Amino acid sequence: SRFAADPHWLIYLPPTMSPCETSKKEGMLEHPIEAFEYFRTRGVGKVVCEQKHMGSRAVVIVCKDSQVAEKRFGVLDGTAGICYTRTGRHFFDDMQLEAELIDRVRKVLDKSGFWGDFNTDWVCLDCELMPWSAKAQKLLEEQYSAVGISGRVVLDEAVKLLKQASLNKTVADINELLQRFTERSEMMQKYVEAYRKYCWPVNSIDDLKLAPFHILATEGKVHSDKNHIWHMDTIAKYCTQDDSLIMATNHILVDVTDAESVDKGIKWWEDLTASGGEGMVVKPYDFIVKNGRELLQPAVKCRGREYLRIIYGPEYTMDENIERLRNRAVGKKRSLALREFSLGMEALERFVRNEPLYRVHECVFGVLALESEPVDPRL
Amino acid sequence: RHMSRFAADPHWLIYLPPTMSPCETSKKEGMLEHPIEAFEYFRTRGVGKVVCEQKHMGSRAVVIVCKDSQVAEKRFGVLDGTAGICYTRTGRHFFDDMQLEAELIDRVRKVLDKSGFWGDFNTDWVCLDCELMPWSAKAQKLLEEQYSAVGISGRVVLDEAVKLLKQASLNADINELLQRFTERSEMMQKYVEAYRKYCWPVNSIDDLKLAPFHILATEGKVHSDKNHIWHMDTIAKYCTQDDSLIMATNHILVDVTDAESVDKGIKWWEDLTASGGEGMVVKPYDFIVKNGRELLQPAVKCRGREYLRIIYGPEYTMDENIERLRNRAVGKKRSLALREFSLGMEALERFVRNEPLYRVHECVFGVLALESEPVDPRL
């Protein structure tokens, strides 16, 4: 929409996610073994593996009706739910498509007896929304297919002027912004290839698939105390039965200590990524886990070789020495993920407490601010 | 120096124009650039006649046109089926839209057909060195005349550049940060958009104008032996003498030994810059002139006093100005421009005598490499 959703909707922002550690196996960057190892070693014996659908990140809030949205969330535009992205914006430019979605989820919940069983008139769901292409992104079009003078040429001429203005006495980090701007654009192109196989045009709401993995919060409770089997199960019971549009998430339970179990987890992953699939997310059985003083990653992504080849570029390939630089890059991402995760959880807790909105947003904005830090975009 | 930047068939890439040196700084009160130094540059080097050409808002463009697609494939080695190309000084395709480019190329062909250019030159191809310029279809005039007519200059865009810079520096009290945060993520995109809107508001080929200034090469001949009056008149005769997309170039001949002729040149420049244009480009009469063993600049620029406010800032006239006089320090620019010029010519001589493509590109990429050298952007 060019604008963040109504800030009254923004009670949560999904954290960023660390990848596993660099695979020892030849030709491999990421592998289920490093993923499982990280947990087994940190004292966690059971993890849940969830298939990554491809797949855009979506937060979905559903109220029983408009009044509840006005009363509980303080939104005055008369919408009874919202589907927003990871940066706060509305997923769909079309207020009719989004709203159409909400209704679809409201009814399924109605036939589900969800509102009663949970004693609530609203719900916040952490979701993946398919297809990937349904998410509107104007980088590629605007920048690589301009209607008049080529996007890149306008970019270069526009940049040259920036350089000149910067030299003005009334005003050098400048060179960074073009790079951060171009790398964003370059990344995006690769993603299009990676998801090409799993993207189809959406002429109606029927084209959409929505697969929620977290029931984050309802009236009076942030469900960060429920293990992920509970999340997968509860979501299935209450959401996935009735309606095609709502999807169940393929997952497996793995015992990181048990050789037979881990191997089944590997063959599962291998199977998911054989045709370019993104991979899976490995989460500790419990939503929140501590190993002594230290909190542990709530999730660890493990991505397919073919997928990762498109993302890194098949040209990249190398190298042994470079990998050392990757691991350090992994460490930053972990510290970052933890903090974003904690800020995201606190926001929900503050909102559920009925605390002032600005305190909720204090956390919510912290997530957004942490994502401002520079990091390896590929991981 | 990359091909990715070219995004076009590499066989097309037979020439890149050099950067241009600005004139030595002026001693005239309140002036940074003035025609007198441009004229003295050549005069002190035994060049008695120079051609001044108006510099129009727009960009330098290389236009190559073939009689048809079969001529391109055979003569140029092109394989992508195109029959012409229009590309930037930085080696970029001018248009993301190929249809739009084909349209421009075809219009040029039709003008060349009507003229009898092909027959007279005993060539089925031509390489043109041109200005490509934003044109107001509604006003049927150059966009820069439409801006100047109400005192609007590139100041609007520069304001945008300065506005971006400030935001980049810094990177209810809490809520502003939400909307500020979202602004940070897309500020660069906003600036480029502003830049396009002011400099290149184009949606069709009816929004452009082409002003060729060099007939660089045709079958078996590079026209670096032809003086600039020949280029102007031959261009006038074969391209411009048609109510069409092709625009003749405002030019005068100045005798740098004659006080009266110099005053006429000054006045011409003053009227032009008052309104006013960016100024002029001053070329020696002969394309190539080699005082002693040394080669003279192929072209010196003399930019309008007002225009330079965009480039250097509005407060540049206060002095300060003396800093600006002794500030340049043009040697390297002057040397780069000269080196790029020779490479460019060699590229066309090699192509004309049917040397292998890699030989031609060698000079061409040589120009790009030279353009990578750190240099004051305001020159």
UniProtKB/TrEMBL annotation, chain A:
ATP 2 binds at residues 52, 57, 86, 160, 283, 301. GO terms for cellular component: cytoplasm. AMP binds at residues 50-53, 57, 128, 196, 283, 301, 303. Mg(2+) 3 binds at residues 243, 246. GO terms for molecular function: ATP binding; GTP binding; metal ion binding; phosphatase activity. Residues 1-374 form the Polynucleotide kinase-phosphatase ligase domain. It comes from the Bacteria. Keywords: ATP-binding, GTP-binding, Metal-binding, Nucleotide-binding. ADP 2 binds at residues 16-17, 57, 86, 128, 283, 301, 333. This is Metallophosphoesterase. The chain holds residues 480 to 870 of 870 of the full protein.
